């Protein structure tokens, strides 16, 4: 019998890094899951599962919520079973899931003279990454027999790169903030149900 934590996460200065997603669990509370759909402040909204206006009778028990900031034109790579040459190397999602992803503008706060350079993203560490797993590999990419070990030789380049955006953002390449929720129903007691 308490207010849900949904109001303590939205409208935050920062959430996490590009290659760092934090999983959170919703505490016991009572609320309606159709409030987000009624809101007109989320222009972008895409997902799979029951319709927003009907997913109320079947109360969820398990909630997995993540939030991050990415490039605006990455919506093409946010889809189930994606086989993009870059997406799988950083993020991957399976087709057997029921959940919804929303995105909105991120330039309202991440704007200043000289652009933004705090965000970093990886390119390649060893091979394609399976979904639901992360690793921190500091080893430099190897493209030959002699181990460069940080030497700028044999195509040994730094795998991580930072964003760059001018305050005069034009085309939709400007960064966006993306939040993804997944709901799982089980016979175990449900934290939220009514």
């Amino acid at each position: 019998t308490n207010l849900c934590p949904f109001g303590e996460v939205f409208n935050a200065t920062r959430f996490a890094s590009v290659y760092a997603w934090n999983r959170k669990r919703i505490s016991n509370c009572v609320a309606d899951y159709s409030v987000l759909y009624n809101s007109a402040s989320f222009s972008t909204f895409k997902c799979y599962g029951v319709s927003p206006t009907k997913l109320n009778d079947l109360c969820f028990t398990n909630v997995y919520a993540d939030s991050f900031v990415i490039r605006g034109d990455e919506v093409r790579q946010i889809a189930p079973g994606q086989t993009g040459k870059i997406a799988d190397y950083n993020y991957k999602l399976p087709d057997d899931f029921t959940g919804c992803v929303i995105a909105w503008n991120s330039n309202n706060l991440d704007s200043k003279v000289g652009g933004n350079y705090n965000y970093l993203y990886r390119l390649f560490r060893k091979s394609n990454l399976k979904p639901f797993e992360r690793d921190i590999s500091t080893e430099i990419y190897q493209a030959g027999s002699t181990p460069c070990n940080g030497v700028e030789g044999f195509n040994c380049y730094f795998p991580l790169q930072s964003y760059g955006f001018q305050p005069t953002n034009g085309v939709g390449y400007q960064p966006y903030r993306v939040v993804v929720l997944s709901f799982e129903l089980l016979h175990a007691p449900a934290t939220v149900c009514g």
Partner: nanobody
Amino acid sequence: QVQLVESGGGLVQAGGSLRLSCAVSGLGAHRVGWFRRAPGKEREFVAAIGANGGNTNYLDSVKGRFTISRDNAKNTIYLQMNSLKPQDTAVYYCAARDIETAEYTYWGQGTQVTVSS
């Protein structure tokens, strides 16, 4: 574009701090580094600093009082060789980290400062 040039140098008997800066016309979100000119047919890596300033790397003979930092106003770059001794030779190569697509690729220069007994 970004203009990289280096010209100067000079040194005296062992004394206080020594400061040389590789001229750069601002670095917004692009890398820059220094290359060791070892006695061989190829150069060697020295250090690389990202835009965020993290992931700092140094050679086996650089850990210690030597440090490098960046400024948010004019991207001023500090150098090593603080509290020198009459045994070191100072010749580097400024590198623009040609892996980038700002306008083009550019190459820096360096000096041959030396010490005296």
